[PDB]
Subunit: 120 residues, 4 copies
């Protein structure tokens, strides 16, 4: 039940299709950072998860280049999907920027997002 | 630059194809963890990187399910490709396992990987 | 502001004393993991925070050894204290277990914690 | 064998004493960021680690305020010590800054450092 629209706490929006194979493909609209419009997203998910109640592991990447801006950065979300009345995708994320060698050490931001099927 | 076979510090291999559109595709074989054989890889990279000597932002995911195993988990690498005599893909990763709600707190491991174009 | 008893989202408690010098001292009791009883806590915080409405940078460590248990691991929380009607300590943490070299790759878990001044 | 001077790959220097109890106390000189001089560091370590070859879990915090600058930030290192000819402390780190609420999402940098008993 991953296919559809999801909203994080910060008002960001993404749409995705979860293929029967394990493909995640869709769009991400970010409500923060140097971003404007929709950005392509692609990732993977466990298409045959544990049947003991455990969530479904997944992950996806968005490169912050589109027709509007190019932040020269990229975020990957790593987390799991959990079904039910209060369905949510809980993730941790890493945002790496292209940096010179001198600045590499501070190239990566880390955060956490919680996505739900309704807006905050 | 990015397209080709890559090797990390631990014995893992990473064969990737960089699309003109910013797409990352390929297969991954992990030397560690609950894995064996090839796994699908999907990601994105900045197809118009800055020209100031900055690295090239990218990310990809691998879900650890293939025809032989399912670890009920996914790893995302977030990083930057760096050129030179010694080109590298410089990454940090998160590995999230599908868990129950009462084990969600210890769901995600974090680490780093350096990919070089020659075997360790 | 920071000195006092704090509670996270999972049932853990965090009693801390903020020194004038920037020192953080106290005891922690974890509701999760390989833990029971009180554990020593030591850390630091910015004793001269900016006045522009910014949070107050801080961090502390707890090694999971006390007179009753030893989990051969340590957790560091990195975060910022935020004032208001609803003061919070906003954190991300890394939990590193002592491992063998061939398990060093899966040594560290990453997560986040929100500490409030009232019980969950 | 933690007590003494350690150098990371980036030329940073720290000195520490590991008390028989589990106390880490000392100084950190950073070779990167908005830092000048020595900064106080405090943390914890496992003072009775596993006797199977496993490393010794530890963690420490530095608040980036001293007599020279105040970056209004703080780093926590989480990792393990490993003895032997090639002794090293391998860590992951989190650098949180005080931010307004609007900017909290990007308040934390993440990296990895490897410390040795001799300079790079």
């Amino acid at each position: 039940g991953i296919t559809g629209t999801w909203y994080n706490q910060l008002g960001s929006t993404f749409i995705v299709t979860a293929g029967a194979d394990g493909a995640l493909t869709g769009t991400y609209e970010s409500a923060v950072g140097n971003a404007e419009g929709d950005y392509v997203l692609t990732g993977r998910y466990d298409s045959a998860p544990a049947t003991d109640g455990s969530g479904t592991a997944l992950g996806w990447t968005v490169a912050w280049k589109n027709n509007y801006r190019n932040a020269h950065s990229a975020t990957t979300w790593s987390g799991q999907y959990v079904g039910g009345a209060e369905a949510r995708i809980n993730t941790q994320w890493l945002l790496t920027s292209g940096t010179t060698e001198a600045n590499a050490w501070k190239s990566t931001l880390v955060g956490h997002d919680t996505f739900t099927k309704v807006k905050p």
